[PDB]
Write a protein that binds this ligand. Structure first.
Ligand SMILES: *Cc1c(COP(=O)(O)O)cnc(C)c1O
Ligand SMILES: *Cc1c(COP(=O)(O)O)cnc(C)c1O
Lengths: 368, 368
């Protein structure tokens, strides 16, 4: 246990979260939504922590999105509610989904196939509770396409075919496509194509008389530079924005000062005959994200000079011709990881801090 | 808890270990060593499990190699001893190394820099115990080069400069270079270059009068096709061979029938308009190894037809023109992962099985 400890005292490699930066990130996204007049349902997958969720959620512990039944359970066990399982409802685990729907005032699920509706229908929740269902629209990983007349029919069914057992809460899209882009304008165009598609669908839905009270989109890059059409929605659900990361910096969603995550590592050897620094951060601590070479898995914070050039499980090699005097063995560097969600999943504890000193330890759940 | 359960009953994605194949793998490597007349010190990093270690070690719980102080501790807490920390001794965590050296009859460390020796010297173990030190030879990630006269001097010091506080147990190389190769002959050439280098060093060591009783090398690929010169060593320390994996199959260390690990995943959606299967195994469950694209992170066991073409955190996309009838939603596929050590690190439990039925659950340690 390390309360109060100075950062470069921790056993590395060690994932670190600047609680100042995080709180700042949470409140900033809360305000954007306030500004747009819509609700924020933060996704928890970058941190999978109660504390994390608590920040995102402004202290309220209600209205979030999870990627696994593990997180659902964890969050439910920690007192959260209004929990959306942002994932095509897993028909092979319905006893569990029903379990949570019964504990919770509001447990929401998504689906995108008529068969999924069938499966729900044959596992009625009972107790007056109805399956709160959202229709995942693909505007291109999963969901139904809004122009496919099949989407309309499916909405129709979820909403109406059994209103005592199933209800259509809204439509749900995740504009993840914004990750292949580059710079704010193409981010916004994907936001716009997605916002408008969704808006047209709902238009079509009102016209046909299919009640659909909510409409959800969002990803860190589109919600980092929100666009006016968005206020015609009811909720945005980004998540990663609480931490941010190198990729997010490269995309333009944020400035470096916004990235709350680092992986602290130590210089544990010099290698003059190959000009390389040796660090105790391998990929067990960092993950291979941003490689498919290693140069782009991470940046050495405060040191454009150095770049990662190798990663074994428990080692990384750094290069500059070098300067080993500036980097005595035992000195700590701070790696800026490419994909926050991925680094986060390699750590059983996060060292959370303020003013260089450790202030808390968050423990994420994992598994399925 | 799932004792006895049928495999395709498990909550996927789920890492699975064929205990038959594993036991077979353990005994096979035990026999190779018996044949060569040398000792086997299995590395535990592919599984990081007590059960795992127990197999490798033939039931004895002695003589293994770990990659982190976490594993050291775990194994020590589980009754193992003769534990080699196969890693340049971490000078910033010496209170802990000393801790374990004091609990254990035999805790071994490696180093490759004179300064490391200094640091050990100023943290004497006391209690009559001496730091059991091995000299990591680089024959090309870390260690000293055997032709560099500095290596000789360092051996000299470890062995002799303070024989009441520090002793040189042997020399240690890891012929990891065999991972860029391809086919048995270049594997063996790297084995040979490494074996001979090591043998020449020890020759030089005897000549100079530096006592060096042990000599350790090994990696799964060189120990999968051992070479005669190896019997002039005292110990081989591979590890991954207990599980094996796709990469190992591609290299030629093993035949498919040898790979004991799978990640079971489910078909949870069809996508005719893009010809794709949707599976609940994303990279949270598989890792991005073998990508730097996704085609090569894994193979669909029993189905050369399909290949992985996308991986998000909790999803993978499969392609063939398809045949969705052969793959009803809910049917289970078995992914063969590229790098066993990496997939293993994404799982908090391994479902171990025999004859299709689950026989145990191993829980690996993690962290640092
Ligand atoms: C991760 C995720 C989100 C969150 O979006 P980010 O861009 O990661 O902040 C939203 N919806 C789904 C389905 C997700 O998996
Ligand atoms: C992983 C490791 C080994 C084990 O070799 P494999 O080829 O993975 O079986 C041996 N020595 C060191 C230092 C290692 O990190």
């Amino acid at each position: 246990m390390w309360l109060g400890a100075l950062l470069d005292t921790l056993p590395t490699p060690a994932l670190t979260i600047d609680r100042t930066t995080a709180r700042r990130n949470a409140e900033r996204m809360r305000e954007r939504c306030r500004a747009l007049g819509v609700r924020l349902r933060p996704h928890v997958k970058t941190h999978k922590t109660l504390e994390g969720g608590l920040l995102a959620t402004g202290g309220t512990r209600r209205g979030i999105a999870v990627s696994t039944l593990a997180e659902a359970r964890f969050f439910a066990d920690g007192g959260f509610d209004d929990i959306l399982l942002a994932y095509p409802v897993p028909t092979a685990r319905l006893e569990e989904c029903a379990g949570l729907a019964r504990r919770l005032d509001a447990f929401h699920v998504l689906l995108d196939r008529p068969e999924a509706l069938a499966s729900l229908r044959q596992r009625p929740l009972g107790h007056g509770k109805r399956w709160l269902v959202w229709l995942k629209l693909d505007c291109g990983r999963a969901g139904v396409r809004p122009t496919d007349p099949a989407a309309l029919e499916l909405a129709q069914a979820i909403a109406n075919d059994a209103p005592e057992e199933v209800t259509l809460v809204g439509v749900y899209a995740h504009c993840g496509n914004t990750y292949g882009c580059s710079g704010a304008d193409t981010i916004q165009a994907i936001a716009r194509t997605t916002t408008n598609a969704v808006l047209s669908f709902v238009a079509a839905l009102r016209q046909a008389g299919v009640p659909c009270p909510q409409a959800s989109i969002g990803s860190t890059p589109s919600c980092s530079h929100p666009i006016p059409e968005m206020s015609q929605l009811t909720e945005l659900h980004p998540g990663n924005y609480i931490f941010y990361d190198l990729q997010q910096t490269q995309l333009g969603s944020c400035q470096p000062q916004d990235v709350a995550i680092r992986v602290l590592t130590r210089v544990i050897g010099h290698y003059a005959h190959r000009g390389q620094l040796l660090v105790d951060c391998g990929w067990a601590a960092l993950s291979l994200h941003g490689a498919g070479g290693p140069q782009g898995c991470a940046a050495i914070d405060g040191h454009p000079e150095l770049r990662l050039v190798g990663l074994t499980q428990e080692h990384g090699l750094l290069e500059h011709q070098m300067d080993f005097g500036r980097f005595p063995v035992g000195s700590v560097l701070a790696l800026i990881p490419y994909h926050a969600c991925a680094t986060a999943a390699m750590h059983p504890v996060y060292y959370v801090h303020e003013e260089g000193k450790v202030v808390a330890l968050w423990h994420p759940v994992r598994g399925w």
